[PDB]
Amino acid sequence: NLYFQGAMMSVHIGAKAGEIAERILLPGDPLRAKYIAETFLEGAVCYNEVRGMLGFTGTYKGERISVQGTGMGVPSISIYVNELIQSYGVKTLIRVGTCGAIQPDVRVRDVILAMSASTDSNMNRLIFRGRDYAPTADFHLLRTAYEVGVEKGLALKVGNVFTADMFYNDEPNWETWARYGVLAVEMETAALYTLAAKFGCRALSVLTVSDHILTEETTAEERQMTFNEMIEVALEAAIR
Amino acid sequence: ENLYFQGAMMSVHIGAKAGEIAERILLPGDPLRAKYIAETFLEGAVCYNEVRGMLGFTGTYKGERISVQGTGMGVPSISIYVNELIQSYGVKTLIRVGTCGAIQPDVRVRDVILAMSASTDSNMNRLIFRGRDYAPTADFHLLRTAYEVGVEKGLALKVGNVFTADMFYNDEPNWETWARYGVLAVEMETAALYTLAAKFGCRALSVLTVSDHILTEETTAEERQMTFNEMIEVALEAAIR
Amino acid sequence: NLYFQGAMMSVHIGAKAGEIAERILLPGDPLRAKYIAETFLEGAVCYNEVRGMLGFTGTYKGERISVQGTGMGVPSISIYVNELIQSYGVKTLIRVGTCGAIQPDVRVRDVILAMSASTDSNMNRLIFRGRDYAPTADFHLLRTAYEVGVEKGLLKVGNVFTADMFYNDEPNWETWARYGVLAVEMETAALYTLAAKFGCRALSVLTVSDHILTGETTAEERQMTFNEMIEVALEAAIR
Amino acid sequence: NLYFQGAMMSVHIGAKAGEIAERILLPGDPLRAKYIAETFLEGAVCYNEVRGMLGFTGTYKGERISVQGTGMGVPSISIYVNELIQSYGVKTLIRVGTCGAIQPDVRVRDVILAMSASTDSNMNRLIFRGRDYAPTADFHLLRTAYEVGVEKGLLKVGNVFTADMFYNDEPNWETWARYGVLAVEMETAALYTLAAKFGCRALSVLTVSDHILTGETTAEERQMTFNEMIEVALEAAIR
Amino acid sequence: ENLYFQGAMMSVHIGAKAGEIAERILLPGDPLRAKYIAETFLEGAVCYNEVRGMLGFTGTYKGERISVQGTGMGVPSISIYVNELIQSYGVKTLIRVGTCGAIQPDVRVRDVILAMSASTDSNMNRLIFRGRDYAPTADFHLLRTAYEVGVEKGLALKVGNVFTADMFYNDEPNWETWARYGVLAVEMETAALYTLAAKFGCRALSVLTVSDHILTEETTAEERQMTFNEMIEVALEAAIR
Amino acid sequence: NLYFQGAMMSVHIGAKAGEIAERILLPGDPLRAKYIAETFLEGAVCYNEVRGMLGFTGTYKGERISVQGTGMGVPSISIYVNELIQSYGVKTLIRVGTCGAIQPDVRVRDVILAMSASTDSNMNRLIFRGRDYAPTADFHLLRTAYEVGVEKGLALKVGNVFTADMFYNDEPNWETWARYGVLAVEMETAALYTLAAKFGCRALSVLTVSDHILTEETTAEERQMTFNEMIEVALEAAIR
Ligand code: NA
Ligand code: NA
Ligand code: NA
Ligand code: NA
């Protein structure tokens, strides 16, 4: 409940020094963080329960890996990303999440690697004095994730996503965004890419298409299978 | 199922059955504070939502049905929950309870603030009003009731403008400028709550406890507990009157 | 006709020190300031005639009260309010005027207490470097005027919109109404911002004189509602 | 006190048809409109006293000419100019007033012809959806007034800045001066924009009454320069 | 050598020796039009610049030294050349000559326009004046001279505002709105020319021939040639008086 | 000199139908277009002399390739790119050019592949109603260029560039742009990437660092050698 302590004091994360690995996966839902830690990591322990925003650390192929819930939207993920980087020395951050497709050639359960993110957040207009900053993924993470997707034979589109402030927007103008190549909507990536660049860290978002503005029915097994593939891409990207 | 293109009336972030949520609701940011409020102040409280861990509860206070729902942090998070509560569950009275950071020399830690309005650096309203200035404003009658309840309990209750921040960590908040024009404290949700409540003809108020000061007093766990309890009672009374 | 002297010099108000009470009513029409001063005040003296912008000081229930015309619009009232606060030490400022309603349940002759003011003026975007400041009334003034209106059995409380452009081709009134705006006028946002800046108490008490929908009264109707508005304002100022 | 009637209804000007000439001078002070009407016009009749905003119609060299007070600032002059053009058929509109100089080579009592007007008003950003409109004088009016000033041996021609905020904590005058702005006033941008909108001819003739640097005269000096400005304006209107 | 961080005074885009450029200069957009003007109207014209093919020439007109320099298209291109001409070569009088597209019913193809000012959708001045409205404006005395020269030749010469576009191909120009407020014609450079000329205390004017109309007349090669020649003579006379 | 004819009538390019290849290189300087066409292409012919903005078509490894000068700045390149795409059916556009580095670890003669471009142009703020669009390279062109740079052992950085309207800017704020990862300044890429995305075309900028805001002296031979390497990367990217 302190507001003016500084990000290096990380008041939203109750972890001791060292409990968070240099490489971290960022689902939005803390219950997905627990699923990832229990399903894919060895020896996972919980290091944070503040606000119920669970985070865990364990190992994957002998490399230390953390998984931290972020909440929804640019202001929530910006709190957690600032604290992870400035307080815990995190250097590689892979967001794993969903998105809503707006392109006719993108299908539900396709996996998208966000090369960059458009946004209607004000955060960068206020930093850059009204000019246009392009939040952009780390190229080597992106290229690595792409190569792993190839090894696994996945349907993998690479392009721009749109980071919305307003999940419920009366005037999204999706026809305009789609005309200019935007693949899908989500709510966090522009902030992740901007703050990772600010502090010299490496960031990527690996996203599953969970809805389409035009289209498609799926089952629970189907969803869990695609989720597992996205997590495996992220983990390999993190440790290579 | 992570659907993006259902309308708010389908409330995909809230797992409650129709009718499980009361028309009056308290909105702490922290789902663990929702659980504390429900267990401490409400009779017969039942959990209606665990989606994303963002707990919500319904119970009764002085014979009235009351819910209490975590919102998460920031304008985008609370705007999801408020849209769904209003458009899917028929919520009509929405009281945010939480903390804020004072930026005024004469506002003290543990003061309770009633936000009469909220400034912001969110883009949400610039995009709605094509670049003009909308003033997000509390419901007058809730605000007046809460103030009077505070008088009944001999409380302070400062009343004025708060600033809804997008960036908890901001390199350029210019707090001197905001303080100069009378902003009392920083928080991260009220501008969206007040705007959406006005949009749908609902009544909203934020009742906030000062938990930090840009220029400073330390406090005890018990002191914070009793001020917290006092904030909740003001909000609960404001909801049922 | 100076431009680069400070507000402590009172460029536009030809009074000298002490002639202006700490409580002031601000109609927009100077002829209406004269009316208020004669009709409601005991002992009304005219302290200003610069530009015809009449201002008067008198007594009401034994309290000193001034009444000062502002012009029309944010730049005009900003001149007078800066000089009133920074030159003459005015502490309590209550605007009284008319507004055009844009809500179906608000009727002509209803009285509005402006809790806050939206605007399309650039004044605050330029102060807060593009961010959103909410100009807001003093709460104790607002609450006082509300109880007075109740004691006298009258009163809607909410947001008004301060327009720069009386004649606007694109006002988008349906959007402002959707988000609760009650009525349009042209001064309150500047008053609430400047009052907060200098730690003064401000409030707008407004009478609906027109409606977007009904397009709308007798002379006797307008003046009776007007006097009720003044009575609320005078009361709020002295309590 | 109507709000939602069109400008063809002349809400703020209590004249009837034909009482206002097609050529009009626009001082900002209504008391100064009265002065102009008596001192320079033959047969001056007062056609308006709404809000004290006096307006007069008379003759000069056998041509009908009106003189109408505007208030201070873009919203005020916009009200009067809309009604003058759309109700009364005014075609030629010449503002006369003062300004504060921000250039070292411009001196108090110099007369400025405003070729164009910069501004910090939001009026045009909201019309042109954030793009940059340049409010500009009618060239033939500008050229005429320039030749008259020469015939009479007086005159700087350039850009002025129309301010919303007479009292501005952050005017950044060094930046505007670097880019050639001559002086600050508070109305010309709105006049030039509205004149162009309705196909009318407009011009501001301004007297420097203050300087950012010299901070600056006798009463006899101010009034003699003033009369010269009026003489230029009257001449430009009728030629 | 493609240096980005030398100051304008080093004029890396212009290969002229010190003094090879006259204090008075005509600025067509097209380097081939610069060459035509120099060879047709100037005595003793010599080429001083071929960097990027953006030809510039110096010669004499009626015993006065005059240069003529291609600018390229758009605010960023002309702003490079104008900064370097002013800050490196001491240019003081700058007359743009070129074409424009009319958007007014009463402006006709082959009319010659003197731009008294220029509207724009460039961001250049929003960023200089922190979001306020600067009006780029011609030098009054050049404008007046050109008008009078046009009278001497019995020419039309319309005088008013032009719009400096960033986007020759724009899906949303809103020409009806601009025409409503009196914009005569579209071009792509004048706002930058007038702003930079004011910045450095120089005198600038744009003299433009209407070459197209949003609502329409066809013309002959000879007709375009004689109107072109007439535009150049007005600009040359305006430069040396 | 027509203003209202429509981009498909391409009034700035005097080429007959078919004279321009589907794959094109875009130097800014028309004299560099002539150098590229004479040095690297077989059978090159000039198809445009309008405004002196030379363009050429020839062959490289048996594939048809064009080279077209663009002028300086977003408004100039936007005219040529609109006409090439809408009138001549160009589908793959590689800008080859220079840039001014602002990062201390980027050296003069390094080759930069622009993953995305920041800008202070107003063009996208006016299209997207004041929101933030991120102009982004085609991933497969980018990845291909990267791989070719590897085959050749070049010093190849991949990241964001800044597209300036004002070569001479009194307030560039380069410290802020550099803090957020911007590698270098140039004047065209944001427009190229936005218009290529609008029309479903593939675009990339391959840029040589020719100046540094902090630092380095070079020779003519050095410059020509690095220029040749950048052109070879672009040509391979275009035809693979
Ligand atoms: Na911590
Ligand atoms: Na639900
Ligand atoms: Na040079
Ligand atoms: Na063509």
Author numbering:
A (entry chain A), F (entry chain A): -7 to 207, 209 to 233
B (entry chain B), E (entry chain B): -8 to 207, 209 to 233
C (entry chain C), D (entry chain C): -7 to 146, 148 to 209, 211 to 233
Reported in the publication:
Purine nucleoside phosphorylase (PNPase) is an enzyme in the purine salvage pathway that is present in some organisms. This enzyme performs the reversible phosphorolysis of nucleosides to form ribose 1-phosphate and a purine base. There are two major structural forms of PNPase: a trimeric form primarily found in eukary­otes and a hexameric ‘trimer-of-dimers’ form primarily found in bacteria. PNPases are potential antimicrobial drug targets and industrial catalysts for the production of antiviral nucleoside compounds.
As part of our exploration of the biocatalytic potential of thermo­stable PNPases, we solved the structure of the N-terminally His-tagged PNPase from G. stearothermophilus (His-GsePNPase). The hexameric structure shows threefold symmetry through the ring-shaped hexamer and His-GsePNPase can be viewed as being a trimer of dimers (a/b, a′/b′ and c/c′), like other hexameric PNPases. The subunits of His-GsePNPase are similar to each other, with r.m.s.d.s of 0.136–0.160 Å on pairwise comparison. Each subunit is comprised of seven α-helices (H1–H7) and two β-sheets. One surprising aspect of the His-GsePNPase structure is the presence in the active site of several residues (NLYFQ) from the nine-residue rTEV site (ENLYFQGAM) in the N-terminal tag. This portion of the rTEV site was observed to be bound in the active site of the adjacent subunit in each dimer consistently across all dimers in the hexameric structure. The interactions between the active site and the N-terminal tag are dominated by the Tyr residue in the rTEV recognition site. This residue is oriented in a similar way to the purine-base part of the substrate.
